Amino acid sequence: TLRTYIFLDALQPQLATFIGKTARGFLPVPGQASLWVEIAPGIAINRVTDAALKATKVQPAVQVVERAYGLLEVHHFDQGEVLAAGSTILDKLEVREEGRLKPQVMTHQIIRAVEAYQTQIINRNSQGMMILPGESLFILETQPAGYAVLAANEAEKAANVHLVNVTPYGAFGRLYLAGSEAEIDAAAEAAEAAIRSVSGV
Amino acid sequence: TLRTYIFLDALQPQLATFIGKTARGFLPVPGQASLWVEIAPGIAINRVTDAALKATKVQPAVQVVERAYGLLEVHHFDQGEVLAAGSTILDKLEVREEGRLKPQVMTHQIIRAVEAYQTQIINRNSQGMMILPGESLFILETQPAGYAVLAANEAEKAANVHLVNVTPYGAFGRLYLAGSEAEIDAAAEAAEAAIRSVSGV
Amino acid sequence: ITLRTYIFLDALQPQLATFIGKTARGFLPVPGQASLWVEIAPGIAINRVTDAALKATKVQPAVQVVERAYGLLEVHHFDQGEVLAAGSTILDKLEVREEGRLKPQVMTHQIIRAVEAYQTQIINRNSQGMMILPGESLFILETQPAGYAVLAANEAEKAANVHLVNVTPYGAFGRLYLAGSEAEIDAAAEAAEAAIRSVSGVA
Amino acid sequence: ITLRTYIFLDALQPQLATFIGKTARGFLPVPGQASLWVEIAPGIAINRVTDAALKATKVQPAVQVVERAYGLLEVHHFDQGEVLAAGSTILDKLEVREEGRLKPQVMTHQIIRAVEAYQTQIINRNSQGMMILPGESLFILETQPAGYAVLAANEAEKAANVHLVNVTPYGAFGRLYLAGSEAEIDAAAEAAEAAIRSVSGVA
Amino acid sequence: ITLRTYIFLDALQPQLATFIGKTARGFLPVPGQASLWVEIAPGIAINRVTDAALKATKVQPAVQVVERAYGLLEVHHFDQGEVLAAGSTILDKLEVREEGRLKPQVMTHQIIRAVEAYQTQIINRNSQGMMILPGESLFILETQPAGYAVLAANEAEKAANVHLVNVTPYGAFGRLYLAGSEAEIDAAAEAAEAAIRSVSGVA
Amino acid sequence: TLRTYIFLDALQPQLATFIGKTARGFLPVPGQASLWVEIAPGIAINRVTDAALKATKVQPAVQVVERAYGLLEVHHFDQGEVLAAGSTILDKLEVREEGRLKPQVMTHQIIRAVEAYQTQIINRNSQGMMILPGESLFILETQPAGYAVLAANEAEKAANVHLVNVTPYGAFGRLYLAGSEAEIDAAAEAAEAAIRSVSGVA
Amino acid sequence: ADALGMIEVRGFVGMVEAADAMVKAAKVELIGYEKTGGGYVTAVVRGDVAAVKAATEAGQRAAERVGEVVAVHVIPRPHVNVDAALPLGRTP
Amino acid sequence: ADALGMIEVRGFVGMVEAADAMVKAAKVELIGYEKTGGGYVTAVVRGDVAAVKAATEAGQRAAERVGEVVAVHVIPRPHVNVDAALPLGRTP
Amino acid sequence: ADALGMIEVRGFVGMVEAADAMVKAAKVELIGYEKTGGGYVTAVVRGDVAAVKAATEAGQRAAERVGEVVAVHVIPRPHVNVDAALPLGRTP
Amino acid sequence: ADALGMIEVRGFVGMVEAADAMVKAAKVELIGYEKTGGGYVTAVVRGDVAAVKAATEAGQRAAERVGEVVAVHVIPRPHVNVDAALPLGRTP
């Protein structure tokens, strides 16, 4: 099946940097168009990855087969190569773009003026930016897991927030953002508007 | 949704030392009163942690976010601060104390005279006290997972057992205890009587 | 206690035994030994199963993985009689016969010809066994439940000279990455599918 | 027992306290607390010294590292009286005053304007603190002995708006990766260099 | 090839055998077997020496560590004649007499009594063996060469009722953390120091 | 001080596969030209790396600032591009090409018909190909460490072996090759001939 | 299990003085005495090691005032085969 | 049948220390001790030839600390008439 | 069929050590041993050409220590009439 | 299987003396003797490795007095192919 299929037009620098910290493939640089495909069962993603890599010149960064779900990232500077790889992926899955799962937001919250006792734990459970005590925290879960990176990317299009964490694979996709109060408010509005704009089933 | 809400009047020294080996926060010392709150969905515990840390002077040690479940521990020397943090948590969740899931015991078993070929593997798959050959192993699973540490506490209030392992998060809560035969018998009876004395759903 | 997998490997081929030497957390097996894999649910009962073997026979256990909810156990010895007696003791203590195992379902079987380098680098980073090289065919397999996957590995190496890139026998799905040239991957795929589809059980 | 590094931090600036709390094996410090770093050779002898802190005063340890050759101890508390009393107790148990410490040798200080994206992927993969974004200036610093590197972090955040990418105060050399806009990194570089070579010691 | 450590553990006591089996990369030793530790410099030449063991006798290896500079090999088997024959074959392949080993020199030995909880949190995050509870006495031991530390483990458990918290026989210096009540730790300290000081060799 | 400066003319596929299995950065694909520079002290390699990345179009795979030394790999298809990055690196170092250290063979040994009990150890201590019980093993130690990948290139260039391990960082460089006996003899003679024909400061 | 303590005196008088001062100095259990001929008699106490260490070093001090004390030794953990074979009061 | 190992100590303390160190240091059987009078006692370990030879070399090493070691010897294959006529725990 | 390796030793002990080192140093098959009298015995191993090339150059280097190695030879591909007539263990 | 020990003597008398001293020296098993012609005879004992390692080094010292000793060697574990091919009394 097809759980997640989102076309990012470009990677903002904290998201591309975080994928550079986390991924196990060819790391993306900022300014590249990118594509995320999550399927079930997961091990068929090597069919999908090959289906991209025979078609276009794109390079894959993330390929994680976690428990039953297979996540795949590809990227290139030209948007046309990434969209041609996405069309070839959808031809190989014999579906279209609308057959993806419409993401449900499990939890969206804004914690204002986080105590130091909570920032130390959040910093130990995160790989991106360090949250500081007194900063406000934006928290997000999306199902399926992939669409969270869309909620990352558009967020950095809006506000000056620190990408603390994003996990795009697994059962629940997670997003930790940090910053001052108005920045977290604007980024929260942008991330909720980006998740609500995904058509699906 | 609250799954586990268990209070501990005092952490026994091997439980406090095990959480000192495993946790990613302000590690507890023995004698401190403690509190474990597990909720579903997981990421919502980053609200609930805040709901403790704006009320009292408790320190959070464990905050684990699994695929779907979230576990929080808070502790302080004075029991009243921990109970006030627990009352503030139950006020924030709008759920009473008995709205927690009543724990069911998946497996309670005692293996007499564990041979060396099994002790080597159980030692490689654990982080507490090591088990020696010839020592009887008590095995426990509880669902939900957080209640496992209740069985990790009261059992050490019964006999001279070595805490081999306790896992309080994820699908099933797990407890490996080890010691001589009568001590394992008394500690197993105490752990089963501790799990059976918890009201809930 | 449910018996998800009960499979008896009559002989470990050298890449499977070498892979278990890379990954296991027990007494590592050597090639030529007879092996046995028992997977149950819930996982924590496998410690009760392992003792049931270790008080019975002279077998030595290599793998004991306790997942979220499943439990995988491997025992092995040079003598097939010791290993089958340990399996008989395990089935006597479970009081479930050999047919009570879950019959394995093949979720995905694929053969990818001429894997590009951009995919081989990621496959090599995400797998522990033999490295795949760019330009070589890849065989992909998943079985539910997971403990049959090593069987799908083992008979595959009894087919043709294929690499053992990965075999994960524990989880919700058992995974198998094999690599090699086209005809060898074809023979190994035919042998592994014939070995999985010859296993009886329940569904 | 040789006293290499004895440095006292009067107030933990929040990114250093955050990064220490991300790397500590102990009790995590919160920002604003006073902090203290003692480094000796040999390593395992620091397990004596830590005891002499915790028996005497109210202080709490964050980072105790007994690595291949040397040994490093952090103690921190809100009151500077308790931290200075633990420092005097440490230096009485070592029977060495402050002046027996090694003067920090500044072996490398380099500001790299507009770090390319291909290099930021490496630096972000090697680091545990912040992430450096492409185009931001980098400041790298190497001191010997290594413990004074946390001083070089603290004063840096005390004088500019930078990001603490990494600091390694244990091992052969003390490494410091800062990153930010160009003027902020020039201010942080001047402040960190002056703070390192504005202390006493024995060369 | 320099022979640093050559020690023959005549019978593995259960906490040392359990700790080695918790840390060894190989065939796990079981309590009761005879054992042998050989450390040479440089490291990779131990792959010659290991072959000379495994072609000669029936002994099984557990720890073969080729670290940054040195190299360590453990071989263990029930019959003490088998392990002594493997030791003789190792010392012939090295072309050395036995007494060319470095004499173990006790660098740091300290009984830290009634350890505070805060130091136990760090020691328990820095150790894979037993825990240490607050208030129990600790025994830290450093020896050079590193491998003799496991002798300092073995004889210690051969004396009194202690908890083996850590032993590292690989690296620059061999470390030993023991823990327990005070009389047990005093008996273990006398026994471990008398074990290390009675091993001859070149200095 | 420029310890190693080795230019790999073409990455062979098991070496490129193993580097991409252990790289912190951009994974090299086979056929690309590559380049390895080790200097002492370590963190000064970030002076070096950026310099090449400001000059040419090369991409870095392995940059290791470990306990004592510093290691940099750069790789690209065009060999003129990798050589231009190398000349930029040597200009930033202000040394010539032959300011390197001539590689010392600390230990070389072919161990024939390895028992299974040692292959379990070697396979547990390796991130490359497996060794099977009975296959011959070639171990190699070089100083300084970076030249180890040179010994992993030419050997694979000259026989049908398995690359079990190559470590080009740390105090000493290590090389574990494995395969049938004739192929391991050819690969060992090729590795020694690759190490011998490298000039520098002895 | 229980740590072992021994005072051997060439003489029954010094042995009874040792076996008196050992059980008066701390909490050890006197299990018996072994007569090995030639005037050598050996008093054997048995308890936890923190008490038998304080017991034997006081019993030696008191038995050096009346007689000749041959050997004084404390075994912190005797093996179970020793308690099976040699008569140390804990014969199963 | 099995190999024979002996520690003779003038005094009971050194013999019990030797008979503890022997059954710790190897997988042997302490079949007991022979009292020849005069203060001499002989502890007898008895087992396979590899373990008794490495057990008596620990019993000697631990009985010289506290005792006067009279004689130490190992017999790898004792003759059948020796086991028939002398008390060494293999009386048929 | 397969290549042929031989070690001739004046002495049975040296030949047993050579025949052990040969089969431990590669995958060769010791098919037997031939007694030409006068104290000369010949160990004959057999397998593919590189394995017997390693086996004999380990058996020589391990049999000069204990014996007197007369002759070493490796035939990389013997003629089928040699296997048919002479006793090399592959006689059809 | 069991470890192997051999004495080669130029003479039947020295071989019988060595084969007597080996089985009187430890728990070994004289399985037989090999006549390689020319007056060379080889006595073969076979047991666990410490027993044969003591027995051959005793039988050598007892056989050098009364004869010419050519070779003495102990193999702690012979390969399965050696005991399958060469006649050492352990051929299944």
Q: What is the 3-state secondary structure (H, E, C) of B29-80?
A: CCCCEEEEEEECCCCCHHHHHHHHHCCCCCEEEEEEECCCCEEEEEEECCHH
**DSSP conformational letter for C104:** P
Q: Are J22 and J59 in contact (CB under 8 A)?
A: yes
Provide the residue ranges of all domains of chain I, joining segments of one domain with +.
Answer: 1-84
Q: Does C78 touch chain E if contact means CB atoms closer than 8 Å?
A: no
Which of A17, A19, A27 is the best residue to mutate to test the F interface, defined by the most F CB atoms within 10 Å of its own CB? A27
Q: Report the C-alpha gap between E72 and E39 in whole angstroms.
A: 4
Q: Which letter, b or e, does each residue of H61-72 get, where b requires 16 or more Cβ atoms within 10 Å of its Cβ?
A: ebbeebbebbeb
Kindly state whether residues C80 and C98 are assigned to the same domain: yes
Q: How far apart are CA A74 and CA C23, in angstroms?
A: 30
**Interstrand relation of F70-76 and D60-66 (parallel, antiparallel or unpaired):** unpaired
Nearest CA in chain B to E30: B116
On whether any CB of chain F is under 8 Å from the CB of A77, the answer is no
Resolution (A): 3.5
* Cα-based distances in Å from E22 to B118, E14, E128: 12, 12, 8
What does the alpha-carbon distance between residue E80 and residue F132 come to, in Å, rounded to a whole number? Answer: 30
Decide if B199 contacts B160 (C-beta within 8 A).
no
Of B101, B122, B157, which closes a domain? Answer: B101
- Second-level CATH architecture of I1-84: 2-Layer Sandwich (3.30)
Do E16 and E96 lie in a common domain? yes
E12 and E94 housed in the same domain: yes
**Which range marks the domain in which residue E120 is found?**
103-199
Q: How far apart are CA A186 and CA B75, in angstroms?
A: 35
- Looking from the CA of A102 toward its CB, the CA atoms found within 13 Å total 7
Contacts of E34 (CB under 8 A, 6+ apart): E8, E9, E10, E11, E12, E76, E77, E78, E79, E80, E82, E83, E84
Torsion sign across C-alpha atoms D156, D158, D161, D165:
positive
Q: Are F122 and F170 in contact (CB under 8 A)?
A: no
- Chain E residue numbers with beta carbons less than 8 Å from the beta carbon of F122 are 47
**DSSP at A130:** P
DSSP H helical ranges for F69-147:
79-93, 116-124
* CATH label of the domain that carries residue A42: 3.30.70.1710
Q: Closest by alpha carbon to D117, among A130, F139, A20?
A: A20
**Which chains touch I (3+ CB pairs under 8 A)?**
F, J
The half-sphere exposure of B24 on its side-chain side, counting CA atoms within 13 A, is 16
Between chain C and chain I, are at least 3 CB pairs below 8 A?
A: no
As given in the structure block, the two tokens for residue H36 are: 């020849």
Which residue, chain included where needed, has tokens 């946790």?
A: B23
J contacts of I23 (beta carbons < 8 Å): 79, 81-82
- Looking at the structure, tell me whether residues B65 and B106 fall in a common domain: no
Domain end, chosen from C72, C102, C132, is at C102
Q: What is the H or E stretch that residue B196 is in?
A: helix B181-196
CB A65 within 8 A of CB A45: yes
- CB of E115 less than 8 A from some CB of J: no
CA atoms of G40 and F108, how far apart (whole Å): 65
Phi, psi of A16 (to 5 degrees): -65, -35
C-alpha distances out from residue B167 to B153, B197, C66, C67, D69, Å:
13, 20, 12, 12, 35
A40 SS3 class: coil
> By the 8 A CB rule, do I18 and I63 touch?
yes
Block residue for tokens 């004596």: D48
Which phi-psi region, left, alpha or beta, contains residue B185 (left: φ > 0; alpha: ψ -120 to 50)? alpha
| Helix, coil or strand: residue F131 | coil
**Residues of chain F found within 8 Å of residue D125, distances taken between Cβ atoms:** 24-25
Residue F2: which residues within 8 A CB-CB, separation 6 or more? F37, F38, F39, F90, F93, F95, F99, F100, F101
Interface of F with I in 126-145 (CB under 8 A): 134, 136
Is the Cβ pair E48, F106 closer than 8 Å? no
Q: Are residues A97 and A34 in the same domain?
A: yes
Looking at the structure, tell me whether residues F188 and F135 fall in a common domain. yes
From C41, C72, C102, give the residue that closes a domain: C102
Residue located via tokens 């020691």: E123
Clarify whether residues A88 and A176 are in a common domain: no
Verify that D70 and D136 share a domain, yes or no.
no
Q: Which helix (H) or strand (E) holds F140?
A: strand F136-143
Instruction: Please check whether residue I70 touches J, CB under 8 A.
Output: no
Best mutation target among E161, E178, E185, E190 (most G Cβ atoms within 10 Å) is E161
Cα separation, D23 vs J12, whole angstroms: 77
Let me know: does I65 contact J71? Beta carbons within 8 Å. Answer: no
| Residue E160, min C-alpha distance to chain H (Å) | 12
CA distance E177 to E186: 13
Nearest chain J residue to I33 by CA: give it: J86
Same domain, A79 and A114: no
What H or E segment, with its residue span, contains residue C66? strand C60-66
| Through-space distance between the first and last CA atoms of chain J, rounded to whole angstroms | 11
Residue D132 near residue D39, CB atoms below 8 Å: no
Closest C-alpha among D78, D67, D100 to residue D31: D78
**Residue C139 and residue C92 share a domain:** no
Q: What HEC string does chain D produce? A: CEEEEEEEECCCCHHHHHHHHHHCCCCCCCCCCEEEEEEEECCCCHHHHHHHHHHHCCCEEEEEEECCCCEEEEEEECCHHHHHHHHHHHHHHCCCCHHHCECCEEEEEEEECCCCHHHHHHHHHCCCCCCCCCCCEEEEEEEECHHHHHHHHHHHHCCCCCEEEEEECCCCCEEEEEEECHHHHHHHHHHHHHHHCCCCCEC
- How many structural domains comprise chain E? 2
Nearest CA in chain F to I49: F182
Do F112 and F192 lie in one domain? The reply is: yes
| Cβ separation E11–H50 shorter than 8 A | no
Question: Cβ neighbours of residue F52 under 8 Å, at least 6 residues apart?
Answer: F58, F60, F72, F74, F85, F86, F88, F89
Distance CA(J2)–CA(J77), nearest Å, equals 7
Examine the domain organization and report whether C76 and C136 are in the same domain. Answer: no
Q: How far apart are CA A194 and CA A171, in angstroms?
A: 20
Experimental approach was cryo-EM
Q: Copy the structure tokens of residue D124.
A: 């972000």
Residue of G nearest to E181 (CA): G50
Q: Which two tokens stand for residue E149?
A: 């530390």
